[PDB]
Hints:
Chain A: The record marks 127 as: Transition state stabilizer. The complex is a heterodimer. By secondary structure, chain A is mainly α.
Amino acid sequence: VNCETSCVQQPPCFPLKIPPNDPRIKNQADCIPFFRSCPACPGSNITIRNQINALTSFVDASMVYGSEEPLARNLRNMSNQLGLLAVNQRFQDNGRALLPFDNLHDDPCLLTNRSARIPCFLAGDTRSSEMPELTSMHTLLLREHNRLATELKSLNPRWDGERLYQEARKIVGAMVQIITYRDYLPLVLGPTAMRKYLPTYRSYNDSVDPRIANVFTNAFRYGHTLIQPFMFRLDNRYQPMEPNPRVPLSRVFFASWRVVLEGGIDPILRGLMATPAKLNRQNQIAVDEIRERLFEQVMRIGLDLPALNMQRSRDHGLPGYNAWRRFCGLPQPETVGQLGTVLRNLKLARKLMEQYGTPNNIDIWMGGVSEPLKRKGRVGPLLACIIGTQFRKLRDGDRFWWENEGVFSMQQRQALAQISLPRIICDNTGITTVSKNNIFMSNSYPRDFVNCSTLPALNLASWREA
Amino acid sequence: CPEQDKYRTITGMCNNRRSPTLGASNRAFVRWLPAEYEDGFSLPYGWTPGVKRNGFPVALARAVSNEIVRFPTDQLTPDQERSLMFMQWGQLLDHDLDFTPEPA
Ligand SMILES: *[C@@H]1O[C@H](CO[C@@H]2O[C@@H](C)[C@@H](O)[C@@H](O)[C@@H]2O)[C@@H](O[C@@H]2O[C@H](CO)[C@@H](O[C@@H]3O[C@H](CO[C@H]4O[C@H](CO)[C@@H](O)[C@H](O)[C@@H]4O)[C@@H](O[C@H]4O[C@H](CO)[C@@H](O)[C@H](O)[C@@H]4O)[C@H](O)[C@@H]3O)[C@H](O)[C@H]2NC(C)=O)[C@H](O)[C@H]1NC(C)=O
Ligand code: HEM
Ligand SMILES: O=C(NO)c1cnc(NCc2cc(C(F)(F)F)cc(C(F)(F)F)c2)[nH]c1=O
Ligand SMILES: *[C@@H]1O[C@H](CO)[C@@H](O)[C@H](O)[C@H]1NC(C)=O
Ligand SMILES: *[C@@H]1O[C@H](CO)[C@@H](O)[C@H](O)[C@H]1NC(C)=O
Ligand SMILES: [Ca+2]
Ligand SMILES: [Cl-]
């Protein structure tokens, strides 16, 4: 039973049924395709079905380096003792490195433009090509590895290939941890939930379970509410890059050819920095570029990402809204009126009640994103508890956390405290004007922007052994 | 696990020395609440026609999306206090944390 072409409900498929008067799909014999997640124990009549995490739960830049041994060695340049990641062998972005090409059997990136013949990129995670903005972030971190490896080879001539790669990998991972917990998370959670769920780091506790919880794979999809219906590219004066400044998202999905043959990563990074996020509002949850036309170029029908989210939660056997509220120690509304108070929105509580019958049944992503946002945060109380709890676990339960004693020297921690995403963008692109920190708040050029000369470079002096 | 190691393993194995697969790749998710399946152990809610969840009909995911999520794009609110880079770092970070396999 091919889930992509068939609408039959048999394993491993769980197609999404289409209601009457759907605004796009007029035939109710049609479906949105859906493959059930792989079970941790297939065919068992003992275990309660659980799903697999193919990646390392740790904030360790596994999207750059990979989570499995054969991938990880194949991502490395084994042609010298310079400790580098492998780079594209056919293309360069105005003389700067791109990701290598992958060799898949049914490569979707080829389907996005049959004329360009540009395949998907090979990185540590399989989704690197999903949108060119993501590809740009992956390419950036590939370059930073390669830059740090080069300086380490000059600072320490005795260091071999393996030493150079590992030391450069350790730094990159700490940079992801610093940007995430210092810059990103306070803006997700807001100060009241940051203080409550992520109090000041003490040290490594080997009794804190660092696994990703099944609910997190769905809750953290809150991000789908932040998605703008275009990819925005800007030239060196931050002004629209013609002839296509705003490409609709449904024509960028797996459009790896746009990085390769339409300007590189510079115009994409500038657009990320100088375009606002979409704001999540209770009557403006998610755009039709992802609700109607997700992956339209690469398959027979356009997907519905929010609907896929709700289907996935059921597939994963995730309890509903009230059960998660109770987990988080938050009151659990039972009537439309109580749901109305909790949402501060009776109109939305009524829609949710007509759909779900009871707030007990509201699917977690839907309940989660429906809640009013915390002050200075971008999630409601439920999501802030779930995301917060996961991140505190990932920090307190990681023996290689950057602040944990012995991972770095005292002088190395002091230098790493100076890093920033703007400075990494400076050091690895042709971009000379970047966002003032915090890069995740700054969105308006020229007002929120500064010269790369004003930002201090990371000091690798404390990595010299001499 | 080795007694000493300066760097992470690629799989995440040995980060926790008492339970060395915690946070390692290709392992089951931890559950913070027991699973809720239509038959109690494997079939998802909405799988079988007429089988209710907590005594109410299961709502089609596509119908909830049509009724609550759908909005005209011309109403879109730009976030004055967040860049699109805030969206993109979230995705990138998600990609450092989890990927739930499905059969090909
Ligand atoms: C290293 O980390 C450990 C884990 O810390 C947790 O996760 C972190 C992310 C952070 O959020 C912490 O706040 C978390 O607690 C931590 O060890 C935990 O320590 C707590 C407090 O001692 C333990 O909690 C106790 O558990 C018992 C037993 O019941 C629990 O388990 C059952 C079955 O799952 C549940 O039904 C219960 O609800 C509990 O979850 C409780 O018993 C009694 O304790 C009190 C008086 O003695 C009283 O207040 C209570 O009313 C009750 O009668 C107890 O209350 C509390 O819930 C927890 O189980 C520990 N976890 C582990 C994995 O061992 C370490 O302390 C931390 N070390 C340092 C130095 O920081
Ligand atoms: C260009 C933007 C994005 C696209 C096109 C996209 C697309 C997808 C798709 C297709 C899925 C799987 C749907 C399913 O079958 O269940 C998915 C899952 C997910 N997404 Fe998004 N996504 C985007 C942005 C984001 C953002 C910004 C965040 C976080 C702030 C995010 C977090 C997640 C998480 C955690 C998963 C589950 C991952 C897994 O365990 O496999 N997404 N998304
Ligand atoms: O970007 C994502 N999250 O942030 C994301 C995208 N796609 C899937 N799964 C569906 C998928 C994945 C891939 C993958 F994993 F290879 F990129 C390829 C396709 C297809 F069929 F469109 F080519 C679909 N899961 C995800 O988490
Ligand atoms: C390996 O490194 C050398 C030196 O920078 C470079 O010229 C070559 O293209 C690299 N090979 C790969 C596969 O990255
Ligand atoms: C496909 O790529 C080519 C360059 O190979 C480009 O000129 C053409 O516009 C692309 N197709 C579309 C629809 O943009
Ligand atoms: Ca990881
Ligand atoms: Cl869970």
